[PDB]
RNA sequence: UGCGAAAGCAGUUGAAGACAAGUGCUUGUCGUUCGUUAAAAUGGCCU
């Protein structure tokens, strides 16, 4: 995906209706990007527990 | 008030001033002088509820029989106590979790 | 060295001096030494309250601070020693916690924007690399 | 889709739509915009004479009502105004502030 | 849509008397003009308040603003200008060159930035990308990001020159929310082609260390959101 | 999982298998955080190309 | 509780009387009043 975006970037700029054409890519990235703060919060709680029983 | 409308039960605060138990329950027959009872709430209340919360001693509902032998007192903890008015003997019914 | 720094910190905490912040910000502290100090050398609720107040004020006055010793101190403090910090119900301590909350809240919104900018820069690096190669 | 693209957050949002469907009147906070539906963007005129698509008002818009294709009622937190779209002129304004 | 705007068919106060009194007031008399105008409107607050709806007529604003500019083109501006800058129904036409005329006076310039409606994106972005860096940069950034669409901001950054874009980039790199959104808009504006390798590498390192510190601060945020057989004991009797 | 950590955090210091489960779920969470960050970066790249 | 976008930002719960329990004293309670903007009676849902 990233190599396609890098190599064919100018053609993607030139073509219009890019969200409509790449609609699946946008939503697939949106879900993963939206899940981030909950993952970070769970990471911090699990850091607390693991560090506590590691010191103990 | 009973279903036929001949009997009236009421619970009153005045027993707190005039007696050891806080509240008094009085059953009066309206149209004639057949039925008259007055008893403190402390006799009805269980001996386990003094250590508990105030929900266990708070009367949220009452019902009185048409023939006047039964008095159902429902509390804020979800317990229904049916009192035989002739002998002041209670029976406990527990299904309700809330009031 | 580390024991001398810990003794100086204990003396400054006892004397309520302002040098406790300098002792915490000193580069003599390493992470196992920080963990050992937090595990053993703190028993006084007043001294723990004082070090928490100065750490929280120092972080709140500059949340986007490149140094990591003070955030490491706060992280290990909250990780290992939270319960007595909840028991301390001082109003100024609660207000300081709210201020530190307000200072640290903003970086949550920033992180998606910074990640997007980093992605754009990553594309620009690899496009320049392709243009240079061919 | 019309992207928000703002750091501006406001619950004072009203919409109106012309009966032929050509124009959408979007009142957001104090601004009021006219949008061409076909482009779903802001209305721009080639002549660009006596046609302003954005209205800036005194307070936040509560209601936008497009009566006919001509008359546009805008209720703010202070005043209730009628604007004639063809004329581009405010017919009359009333003071709703003491209520 | 075609017929819009093209029709061929065509506490009360005396605004005309207020304009006449302000005209009779002498030029460069800031105190006299302010006293007469505030006595005519009869509201105490220097900034605009919800009380005075009736002054919001536009022709009064045009005549008063023209009289102010004529009277104090060279002299110091009165508090009447401050009140009109706080006023929401400011005329659209004056904002085209408002900032240039009030650039010399910093207090009135800042008041126009933070309160005056309809400051155009042209002069706003030009003043932001100016090399003055007089710490009003945050207010200008907040103003443009709050009041203008991301597409239009990007389109105006397309028009703006590459050198000032560069200078803004090393200014950010040397050294926040509005700043990062602005940097994202600047990157979108310059696009694929034009960015130098050295500046790009410094910007990459800067963004990487900010990502590290941001993730660290979110961690701290969520941290704040977070019978033996034989026992030998002493007895006192 | 967070409610589990809140209620039963003391039994981690005793039970060894729960510690192994916590460490495995930690590694999985780190992998998913990396995937989410990568998706956000590609979303920014897509925004640069679309705009 | 007030305002505000969801984020948040400021702000706040005082008295009086009566009763109970413990031991005149202490503490709690309120089918009490006045003032401020301010868990737990083995007890789970029909055919």
Report on this structure.
This is part of a larger assembly, with one copy of chain A (56 residues), two copies of chain B (99 residues), one copy of chain C (134 residues), one copy of chain E (237 residues) and one copy of chain F (51 residues). Chain A has 56 residues and is mainly α. Helix content of chain A is 86%, strand content 0%. Chain A is built from five helices and no strands. Chain A has helices spanning 2-7, 9-14, 18-21, 23-34, 36-55. The longest helix of chain A has 20 residues, at 36-55. Chain A is elongated and about 60 Å long. Chain C is an all-alpha fold and 134 residues long. In chain C, helix 4 crosses helix 7. Chain C contains seven helices and no strands. Chain E is built from twelve helices and no strands. Chain E has helices spanning 15-24, 30-41, 58-71, 79-86, 98-101, 106-115, 121-128, 137-147, 150-159, 162-174, 177-190, 197-225. In chain E, helix 1 (15-24) runs antiparallel to helix 2, helix 1 packs parallel to helix 3 (58-71) and helix 4 packs parallel to helix 6. Chain E is extended. Helices cover 80% and strands 0% of the residues of chain F. Chain F is built from two helices and no strands. Chain F has 51 residues and is an all-alpha fold. Chains in contact: A-C, A-E, A-F, C-E, C-F, D-E, E-F. Chains C and E meet through helix 5 and helix 7 of C and helix 11 and helix 12 of E. Chain B binds one RNA strand of 47 nucleotides through loops. Chain F: It is found in: Nucleus, Nucleolus. Chain F: This is U3 small nucleolar RNA-associated protein 15. Chain F: Involved in nucleolar processing of pre-18S ribosomal RNA. Required for optimal pre-ribosomal RNA transcription by RNA polymerase I together with a subset of U3 proteins required for transcription (t-UTPs). Chain F: It comes from Saccharomyces cerevisiae (strain ATCC 204508 / S288c). Chain B: Involved in nucleolar processing of pre-18S ribosomal RNA. Required for optimal pre-ribosomal RNA transcription by RNA polymerase I together with a subset of U3 proteins required for transcription (t-UTPs).
What's the main sheet of chain E like? Answer: none
**SS summary, helix count of chain E:** 12
Question: Got a strand count of chain E?
Answer: 0
Give the CA-based shape of chain F.
elongated
Computed over alpha carbons, the radius of gyration of chain E is 28 Å
PDB class: ribosome
Keywords: 90S, pre-ribosome, snoRNA, snR30, snoRNP, ribosome biogenesis, H/ACA, 18S rRNA, ribosome
Entry title: Stalled 90S - Utp23-Krr1-deltaC3
Chain A: U3 small nucleolar RNA-associated protein 5
């Amino acid at each position: 995906v990233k190599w396609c975006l890098i190599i064919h970037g100018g053609y993607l700029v030139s073509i219009p209706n890019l969200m409509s054409t790449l609609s699946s890519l946008h939503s697939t990235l949106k879900r993963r990007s939206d899940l981030l703060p909950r993952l970070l919060a769970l990471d911090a709680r699990l850091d607390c527990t693991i560090n506590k029983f590691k010191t103990l | 008030i009973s279903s036929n409308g001949k009997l009236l039960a009421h619970m009153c605060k005045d027993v707190s001033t005039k007696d050891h138990e806080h509240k008094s329950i009085s059953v009066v027959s309206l149209f004639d002088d057949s039925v008259n009872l007055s008893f403190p709430l402390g006799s009805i209340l269980s001996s386990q509820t003094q250590s508990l919360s105030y929900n266990t001693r708070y009367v949220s509902s009452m019902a009185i029989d048409n023939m006047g032998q039964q008095l159902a007192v429902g509390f804020a903890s979800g317990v229904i106590s049916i009192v035989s008015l002739a002998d002041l003997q209670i029976r406990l019914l527990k299904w309700h979790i809330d009031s | 060295d580390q024991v001398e720094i810990a003794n100086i910190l204990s003396s400054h905490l006892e004397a309520n001096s302002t040098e406790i912040l300098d002792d915490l910000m000193s580069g003599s502290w390493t992470e196992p030494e920080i963990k050992k100090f937090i595990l053993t050398k703190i028993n006084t609720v007043d001294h723990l309250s004082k070090i928490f107040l100065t750490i929280s004020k120092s972080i709140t006055q500059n949340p986007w601070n490149e140094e990591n010793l003070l955030p490491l101190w706060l992280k290990w403090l909250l990780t290992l020693k939270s319960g007595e910090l909840n028991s301390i119900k001082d109003k100024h301590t609660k207000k300081n916690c709210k201020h530190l909350k307000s200072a640290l809240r903003s970086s949550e919104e920033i992180l998606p924007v910074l990640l997007g900018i980093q992605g754009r820069l990553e594309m620009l690096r690899r496009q320049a690399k392709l243009r240079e190669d061919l | 889709i019309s992207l928000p693209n703002f750091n501006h957050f406001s619950n004072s949002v009203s919409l109106a739509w012309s009966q032929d469907g050509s124009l959408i009147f979007h009142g957001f906070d104090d601004k009021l915009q006219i949008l061409d539906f076909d482009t779903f963007k802001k209305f721009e005129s080639l002549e660009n004479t006596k046609t302003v698509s954005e209205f800036t008002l005194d307070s936040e818009i509560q209601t936008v009502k497009l009566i006919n294709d001509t008359n546009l009622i805008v209720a703010t937190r202070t005043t209730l105004n009628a604007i004639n779209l063809l004329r581009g002129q405010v017919i009359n304004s009333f003071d709703l502030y003491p209520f | 849509k075609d017929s819009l705007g093209k029709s061929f068919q065509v506490p009360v106060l005396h605004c005309n008397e207020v304009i006449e009194k302000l005209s009779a007031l002498q030029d460069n008399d800031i105190t006299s003009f302010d006293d007469i105008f505030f006595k005519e409107l009869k509201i105490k607050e220097e900034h605009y308040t919800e009380k005075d709806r009736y002054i919001s007529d536009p022709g009064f604003l045009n005549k008063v603003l023209d009289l102010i500019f004529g009277k104090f083109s060279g002299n110091d501006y009165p508090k009447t200008l401050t009140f009109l800058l706080t006023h929401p129904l400011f005329p659209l036409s004056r904002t085209r060159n408002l900032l240039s005329l009030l650039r010399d006076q910093p207090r009135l310039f800042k008041q126009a930035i933070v309160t005056c409606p309809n400051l155009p994106l042209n002069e706003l972005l030009e003043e932001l990308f100016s090399i003055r860096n007089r710490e009003l940069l945050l207010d200008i950034s907040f103003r443009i990001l709050q009041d203008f669409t991301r597409d239009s901001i990007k389109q105006e950054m397309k028009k703006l020159s590459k050198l000032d874009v560069q200078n803004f980039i090393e200014f950010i790199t040397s050294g926040s929310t509005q700043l990062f959104q602005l940097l994202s808009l600047v990157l979108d504006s310059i696009g694929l082609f034009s960015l130098e390798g050295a500046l790009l590498e410094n910007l990459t390192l800067y963004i990487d260390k900010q990502v590290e510190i941001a993730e660290r601060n979110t961690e701290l945020w969520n941290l704040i959101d977070t019978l033996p057989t034989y026992t030998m004991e002493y007895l006192d009797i | 999982v967070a409610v589990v950590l809140e209620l039963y955090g003391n039994t981690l210091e005793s039970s060894p298998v729960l510690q192994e489960l916590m460490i495995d779920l930690k590694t999985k969470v780190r992998h998913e955080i990396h995937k989410s960050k990568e998706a956000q970066r590609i979303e920014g790249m897509l925004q640069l190309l679309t705009s």
